[PDB]
């Protein structure tokens, strides 16, 4: 298992170009995003993009970003969970995720 | 990053609103949920309320699973989180970067 | 509350019903599915949550997975420490006590 930050971004899903954009180049090395309805008949549409990280630093360079952009005008919530990655070909490399 | 407990509760889809509901009661600043599947396929919800404290995470989901678990399926956990972002949910406060 | 493993597989949507399977097999007390998109422009994948007792059942279910799929098929599978508060299932009529 390969540590990492699940980098949690809810927010508006209008902005998934934009915040995939951001997750693109963080050099994350995907994401996962998913239709959720959030409260912060008053739930409304968001996207929750799920991003592991390799490091925390991108995590929060990832979250940082899409907050300074976007957090002012568009409802949010960026979190980061502790993850391991057991597999994950792209995140873990060919490598795999016991790098011995 | 303030710590932050990711309350999931998944359960029947019908308790949207009620649950929903205690979470509003219980002071949590939002949640968010999402249509999902599963076996315990059979379409529920997933909220995901991150709460300041463990204490708040618990008292919701104690107040669902008392409420509903007993007749509707559903399973609460909780994660760890540190929110970094959450106007809502660190407050004007901000969520304090250096702790 | 009952430490759990989060066991979350992403990977492709064709897979639900094969993931579910070894998700069951793998005496998992059940899964939580959900429609994600992914990049690793978005395709249409799947989300697992399973909650598992221990964390070597999450990793029987990751390495069956990933075995049997993942050189074919998109996926990522990650762990994330959970408790558990409720879950009759999860927990058994024992509660989730601790
Ligand atoms: N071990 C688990 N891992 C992940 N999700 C779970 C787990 N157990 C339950 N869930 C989620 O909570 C829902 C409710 O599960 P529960 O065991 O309380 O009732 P169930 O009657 O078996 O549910 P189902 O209708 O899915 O069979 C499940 O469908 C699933 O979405
Ligand atoms: N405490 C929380 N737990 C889980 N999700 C939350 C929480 N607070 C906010 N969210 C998610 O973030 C989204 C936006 O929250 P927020 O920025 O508080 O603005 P708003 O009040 O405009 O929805 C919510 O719709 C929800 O999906
Ligand atoms: N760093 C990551 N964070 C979150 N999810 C990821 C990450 N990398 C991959 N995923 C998820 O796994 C899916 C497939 O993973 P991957 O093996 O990279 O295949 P692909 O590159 O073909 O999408 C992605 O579409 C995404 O949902």
Redesign the pocket.
Same mark, same amino acid.
């Given at each position: 298992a390969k540590p990492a930050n699940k980098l949690v971004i809810? +927010? @508006?899903k209008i902005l998934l170009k934009k915040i995939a954009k951001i997750i693109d180049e963080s050099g994350a090395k995907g994401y996962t995003v998913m239709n +959720? &309805? &959030?409260? &912060?008949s008053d739930? @409304?549409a968001?996207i929750?993009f799920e991003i592991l990280t390799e490091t925390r630093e991108m995590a929060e360079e990832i979250a940082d970003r899409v907050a300074v952009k976007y957090?002012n005008d $568009?409802?949010?919530?960026i $979190?980061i969970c502790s993850a391991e990655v057991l597999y994950g070909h792209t995140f873990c490399g060919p490598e795999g995720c016991s790098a011995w």
């Open positions: 809810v +927010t @508006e +959720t &309805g &959030g409260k &912060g739930i @409304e968001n929750k957090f $568009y409802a949010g919530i $979190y």
